[PDB]
Structure 1
Amino acid sequence: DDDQVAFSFILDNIVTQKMMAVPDSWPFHHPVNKKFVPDYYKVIVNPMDLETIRKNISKHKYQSRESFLDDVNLILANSVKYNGPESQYTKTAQEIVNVCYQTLTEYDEHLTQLEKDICTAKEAALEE
């Protein structure tokens, strides 16, 4: 029962303590306000930000690194398309991605254990 809660708990701390701690990362903490910036949402088909990711964590959307990294990489891919590949904002998003992979790698063996246990538990549960 503990494993999904623990994994989400770790992800959410990686976000708040490492990713949101990157200098000048504030533009990526919250969604672009669509009421104010409509052109953003005509350009970006799948907008993403760290707050949306935290909401996903709190709902336990991520059961492994891979779908979590999909949304994290999306924050960079969107920045590339809207701000340009050489933008200061994009360089900041690049750093957010790097610190993410750096942190996951530092805890690889622990996260792999959580992922295995989350996945075997869903197997046994549904079987039942």
Structure 2
Amino acid sequence: SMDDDQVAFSFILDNIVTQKMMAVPDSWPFHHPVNKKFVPDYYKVIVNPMDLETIRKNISKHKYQSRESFLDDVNLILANSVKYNGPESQYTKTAQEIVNVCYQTLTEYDEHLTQLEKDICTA
């Protein structure tokens, strides 16, 4: 955590979220936990909610040491939207675009992220 390699890794993840994922058009409903005021049954339907703010808080606490656990939480946003909104919902298409810009940016950064992941583990 105090390790600069961990901090640099978390910093890159945070910027995937703020520069790319939160920039998806109409993505605001995914930026924060679902508000039960407007979606009253959400937490009765969805057992493990996930949203971009929760991921950013995990990043700020250095809870991700490799990209797989980060991508697992990102993917959960989409899977939850398939369950709640439906597989063909406009919201699900937006969530898949959030996933796509994340996944594809992770691919672009593969060699950089691999080095950081190794240096986090070594430390």
TM-score normalised by the chain length of structure 1: 0.91
Q: Secondary structure at the match of 1:38?
A: coil
- Counterpart CA distance in 1 for 2:31 and 2:38 is 17
Supply the distance in 2 between the matched residues of 1:96 and 1:33 (Cα, whole angstroms).
19
> Which string of whole-angstrom CA distances, capped at 9 and with x for unpartnered residues, describes residues 9-65 of structure 1?
000001000000011111100101235534100100000000000000000000000
Name which one, 1 or 2, has greater alpha-carbon Rg: 1
Name the SS of the counterpart of 2:119 in structure 1: helix
Tell me the distance in 2 between the aligned counterparts of 1:38 and 1:91: 22
CA distance in 1, matches of 2:106, 2:66: 11
Q: Which of 61, 64, 86 is residue 62 of structure 1 equivalent to?
A: 64
Query: Which structure carries more helix by proportion?
Result: 1
Aligned sequence identity (%): 100
C-alpha separation in 1, matches of 2:98 and 2:37? 26
Q: Which runs of 5+ in 1 are unaligned?
A: 121-128
CA distance in 2, matches of 1:81, 1:60: 29
Distance of 1:35 and 1:62 partners within structure 2: 31
TM-score, normalising length: structure 2: 0.94
Unaligned runs of 5+ in 2: none
How many residues end up aligned between the 2 structures?
A: 120
3-state SS of the aligned residue for 2:11?
helix
- CA distance in 1 between counterparts of 2:85 and 2:35 reads 16
**2-structure distance, mates of 1:33, 1:119:** 37
CA distance in 1, matches of 2:63, 2:36: 24
Deviates more, 1:13-22 or 1:27-36: 27-36
CA separation in 1, counterparts of 2:113 and 2:27?
Answer: 25
After superposing on structure 2, the runs of 4+ consecutive aligned residues of structure 1 that deviate more than 6 Å are none
